[PDB]
Amino acid sequence: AKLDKEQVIDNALILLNEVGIEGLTTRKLAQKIGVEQPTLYWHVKNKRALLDALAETILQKHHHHVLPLPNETWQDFLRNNAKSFRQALLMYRDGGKIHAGTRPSESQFETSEQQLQFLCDAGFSLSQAVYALSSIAHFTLGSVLETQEHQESQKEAYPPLLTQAVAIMDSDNGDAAFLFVLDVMISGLETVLKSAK
Amino acid sequence: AKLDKEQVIDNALILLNEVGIEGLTTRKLAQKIGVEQPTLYWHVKNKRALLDALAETILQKHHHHVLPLPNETWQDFLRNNAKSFRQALLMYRDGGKIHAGTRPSESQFETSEQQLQFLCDAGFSLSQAVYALSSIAHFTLGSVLETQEHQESQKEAYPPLLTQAVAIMDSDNGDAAFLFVLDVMISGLETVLKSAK
Numbered sequence: 001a002k003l004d005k006e007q008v009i010d011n012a013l014i015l016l017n018e019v020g021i022e023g024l025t026t027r028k029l030a031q032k033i034g035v036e037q038p039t040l041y042w043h044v045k046n047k048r049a050l051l052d053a054l055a056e057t058i059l060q061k062h063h064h065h066v067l068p069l070p071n072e073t074w075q076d077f078l079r080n081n082a083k084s085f086r087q088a089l090l091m092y093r094d095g096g097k098i099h100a101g102t103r104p105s106e107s108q109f110e111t112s113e114q115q116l117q118f119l120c121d122a123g124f125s126l127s128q129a130v131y132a133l134s135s136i137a138h139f140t141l142g143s144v145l146e147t148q149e150h151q152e153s154q155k156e157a158y159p160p161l162l163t164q165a166v167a168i169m170d171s172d173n174g175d176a177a178f179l180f181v182l183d184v185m186i187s188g189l190e191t192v193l194k195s196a197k
Numbered sequence: 198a199k200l201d202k203e204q205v206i207d208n209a210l211i212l213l214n215e216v217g218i219e220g221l222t223t224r225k226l227a228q229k230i231g232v233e234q235p236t237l238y239w240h241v242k243n244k245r246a247l248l249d250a251l252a253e254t255i256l257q258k259h260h261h262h263v264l265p266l267p268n269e270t271w272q273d274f275l276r277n278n279a280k281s282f283r284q285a286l287l288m289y290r291d292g293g294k295i296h297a298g299t300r301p302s303e304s305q306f307e308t309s310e311q312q313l314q315f316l317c318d319a320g321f322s323l324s325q326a327v328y329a330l331s332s333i334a335h336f337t338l339g340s341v342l343e344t345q346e347h348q349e350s351q352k353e354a355y356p357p358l359l360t361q362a363v364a365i366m367d368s369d370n371g372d373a374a375f376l377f378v379l380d381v382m383i384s385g386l387e388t389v390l391k392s393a394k
């Protein structure tokens with residue numbers, strides 16, 4: 001035979017970069033792979049399945065700060081977790097739209113479970129931990145979808161502050177903005193814990 | 198003749214809901230409107246132009262907390278601005294993907310300019326103001342793209358904390374998560390100002 005699932009997914013990651021999330025189809029993956037539709041069907045049963053597969057495997061491949069390191073404060077962890085998640089979303093074309101709307105995978109259960117436990121052990125109620133992890137994902141993803149969709153935008157007279165505001169944001173493709181509000185999020189949450197009185 | 202730009206855009210808003218951002222095309226707008234391509238062309242010259250038009254007009258129509266109200270702290274403003282932006286993104290199918298990657302419009306220059314001035318007058322450096330407005334948009338947009346792409350996901354065994362974490366997030370389609378981390382953002386920034394010593 002031929003097809004192991006990781007080869008299929010690797011071809012799918014190449015295709016995503018070549019044609020983007022919209023033009024990525026099951027039928028096109030089968031072209032690139034050199035195979036019939038119903039042999040692909042056993043690995044990836046529809047487009048949704050395929051996209052969920054990319055979402056996961058992109059994180060398996062490039063999202064390595066999944067867990068607090070022995071020397072880390074929950075502050076450190078959150079920072080380095082979020083940075084790692086963002087570079088991982090930036091790695092692929094439409095990486096932000098690939099992730100959006102997924103839920104963590106079986107391959108991510110033990111670490112994601114751990115991320116929440118780690119936050120509960122830090123002082124946070126569950127809700128709080130859930131909302132903080134969730135929302136740092138949303139923040140990061142929003143940051144990445146915007147900068148990705150922006151530089152893909154080939155369109156063809158701001159006021160003073162707005163001119164600088166947009167200059168500042170086109171400069172680093174959103175880096176400093178990201179790091180700053182990650183930092184205010186983490187101080188925000190610090191104040192949540194200080195709300196033990 | 199027939200076509201004023203607002204009728205075209207109104208038809209485009211109906212279509213977006215009917216077919217979504219991917220299936221929305223210039224050629225399809227012309228169908229719905231009852232008109233030839235090159236007569237549409239004068240209002241909306243390509244797909245990008247069209248999408249930028251939706252992005253703006255959706256905010257013109259549904260994003261009404263553009264400015265601090267006489268009785269508002271910058272805290273109040275940011276909160277109510279962000280809430281207003283999010284409900285505005287939720288109003289349309291793919292509203293989050295319609296906004297992503299745009300830059301504020303001519304119709305938004307005087308208010309957006311004002312939002313930054315207002316923040317500078319509050320104590321924030323420009324950078325800070327730019328990063329806070331930018332990033333609250335990113336946060337809100339990420340929050341909305343995720344919940345929208347999620348409920349559109351018709352796919353067909355979590356651990357304990359993860360089971361609750363996801364239950365909590367499917368409950369309110371992300372509301373409480375949003376309000377909580379908006380609140381920690383705004384406390385985060387409060388600490389930025391306390392960093393005048």
Ligand SMILES: Cc1c2c(c(O)c3c(O)cccc13)C(=O)[C@]1(O)C(=O)C(C(N)=O)=C(O)[C@@H](N(C)C)[C@@H]1C2
Pocket residue numbers: 059063065066081082085102103104108111112115130132133134136137362363366
């Ligand atoms: C806790 C949680 C997370 C995620 C998530 O999508 C999610 C959800 O959809 C419902 C309830 C909880 C969560 C993440 O996407 C994820 O990005 C993720 O899978 C993840 C990962 N695989 O390690 C992370 O590290 C997290 N980090 C970016 C905050 C975050 C954790």
Ligand SMILES: Cc1c2c(c(O)c3c(O)cccc13)C(=O)[C@]1(O)C(=O)C(C(N)=O)=C(O)[C@@H](N(C)C)[C@@H]1C2
Pocket residue numbers: 165166169256260262263278279282299300301305308309312327329330331333334
């Ligand atoms: C300041 C700013 C903003 C936005 C933005 O896209 C942006 C940018 O792309 C580069 C530099 C600055 C900004 C907004 O989208 C917008 O959503 C917006 O247009 C906007 C609006 N039209 O009133 C807002 O109220 C803002 N709020 C959600 C923080 C935010 C303001």
Ligand SMILES: [Mg+2]
Pocket residue numbers: 099102103104137
């Ligand atoms: Mg996720």
Ligand SMILES: [Mg+2]
Pocket residue numbers: 296299300301334
């Ligand atoms: Mg914007």
